[PDB]
């Protein structure tokens, strides 16, 4: 049901959501609830929200055609974090630390 | 409100200020046991308390004296200490916030 490339993608998605990286992956677990976190401007600047919860739903829904479309949403997720938060925020360092994990395993695929 | 509780609201205002947001934010709103999936929080903590609840009682003129105000603020910290393990970071944040409260509160006529 899943291609060989997308099998590796789902395994990558699984590691990013594991207990291993929970110290810095937690900001990206669920979609940004602008009201629940009192960030009333998130949707005035981020017009295409994305988070790991949304990404897994699209993966299980078989909505990703290739690995490129999967990499697009995860990189969009980090771009939303970098575009909205100040550069010195610790969550930005968490986005960096989590993306550095993603880019590593994603680069090692045939 | 009497003159004593006027100073109390100023302490509550400082506890809710921009200054202490780094460690006071867990105690801003009540503990949502369902949003955190802690089915035992209300089986162990029978009197939950937070700073929002304290402000409602302060604005509602429900505190008779400053002692009743300090009782609920210490109950809030006591709730945090009773449930979480001592090595949890919430304990370190509760102490540093309580350390601020006890300092302001001890200096009252």
């Amino acid at each position: 049901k899943l291609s060989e490339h997308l099998r590796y993608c789902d395994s990558i998605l699984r590691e990013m959501l594991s207990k291993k990286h929970a110290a810095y992956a937690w900001p990206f677990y669920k979609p940004v609830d602008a009201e629940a976190l009192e960030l009333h401007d998130y949707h005035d600047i981020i017009k295409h929200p994305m988070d790991l919860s949304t990404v897994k739903r699209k993966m299980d829904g078989r909505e990703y055609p290739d690995a490129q479309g999967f990499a697009a949403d995860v990189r969009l997720m980090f771009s939303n974090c970098y575009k909205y938060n100040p550069p010195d925020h610790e969550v930005v360092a968490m986005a960096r630390k989590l993306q550095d994990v993603f880019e590593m395993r994603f680069a090692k695929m045939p | 409100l009497s003159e004593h509780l006027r100073y109390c609201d100023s302490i509550l205002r400082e506890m809710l200020s921009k200054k202490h947001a780094a460690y006071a934010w867990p105690f801003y709103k009540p503990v949502d046991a369902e949003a955190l999936e802690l089915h035992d929080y209300h089986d162990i903590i029978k009197h939950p308390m937070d700073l929002s609840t304290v402000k409602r009682k302060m604005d509602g003129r429900e505190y008779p004296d400053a002692q009743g105000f300090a009782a609920d603020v210490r109950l809030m910290f006591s709730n945090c200490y009773k449930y979480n393990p001592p090595d949890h970071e919430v304990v370190a944040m509760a102490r540093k916030l309580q350390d601020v409260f006890e300092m302001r509160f001890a200096k009252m006529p």
């Binding site: 937690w26 629940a36 976190l37 009192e38 960030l39 | 934010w25 999936e37």
Partner: peptide, 12 residues
């Protein structure tokens, strides 16, 4: 996870 404004805290 207690959340609020881009802060976080593992209670469970």
């Amino acid at each position: 996870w207690k959340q609020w404004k881009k802060y976080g805290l593992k209670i469970c």
